[PDB]
């Protein structure tokens, strides 16, 4: 995916609920720093739904690709209000940006 295109997507559709940097505050949604390689619902200090905490999968390019296409379908009961991103390419770009931004 194209990191720059993904940055634009993040800023327009995710930033209002999520920060990606280390130490970034939790907002409506949890801070995403360290996302890749971590299990669902493990960011300290954020009140996740039990649905998210119990999904039990590990966040990575593959799991994110599915989750972002339709959040509610992948994690029934999640309190994340987001319809999903239909275009495969857009999800690829966004995930490429997340891979970088949540690890710097
Ligand atoms: C496309 C943009 C977005 C992406 C890529 C995204 C991604 C994520 C990810 C990966 C998680 C899981 C974190 C974890 O398990 O530690 C999450 C959780 C969450 N997100 Fe988002 N998110 C986006 C937009 C939003 C928006 C717009 C809202 C709010 C209106 C939101 C609200 C939440 C909430 C409330 C949770 C925690 C849900 C729960 O505990 O069930 N997100 N998001």
- Domain locations in the chain as residue ranges: 1-104
Measured from the CB, is residue 51 less than 6 Å from ligand 1? yes
DSSP conformation class of 14? T
**Binding site per annotation, positions for heme c:** 14, 17-18, 80
Q: What are phi and psi of 39, to 5 degrees?
A: -75, 165
Q: Which two tokens stand for residue 97?
A: 């940006």
CA distance 53 to 95: 21
Coil, strand, or helix at residue 26? coil
CA distance 66 to 38: 16
Nearest to 81 by CA among 17, 24, 25: 17
CA distance 24 to 3: 20
CA of 30 to the centre of ligand 1 (A): 7
* Fold of domain 1-104: Cytochrome Bc1 Complex; Chain D, domain 2 (1.10.760)
Coil, strand, or helix at residue 39? strand
Q: What approach was used to elucidate this structure?
A: X-ray
Which residue reads 């799991």 in tokens?
63
**Looking at ligand 1, which atom is closest to the CA of residue 16?**
27
Coil, strand, or helix at residue 53? helix
């Amino acid at each position: 995916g194209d990191v720059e295109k993904g940055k634009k997507i993040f800023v327009q559709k995710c930033a209002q609920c999520h920060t990606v940097e280390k130490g970034g505050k939790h907002k409506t949604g949890p801070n995403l720093h360290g996302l890749f390689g971590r299990k669902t619902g493990q960011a300290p200090g954020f009140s996740y739904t039990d649905a998210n905490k119990n999904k039990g999968i590990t966040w990575g390019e593959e799991t994110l690709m599915e989750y972002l296409e339709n959040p509610k379908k992948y994690i029934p009961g999640t309190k994340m209000i987001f319809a999903g991103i239909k275009k495969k390419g857009e999800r690829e770009d966004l995930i490429a940006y997340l891979k970088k931004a949540t690890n710097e």
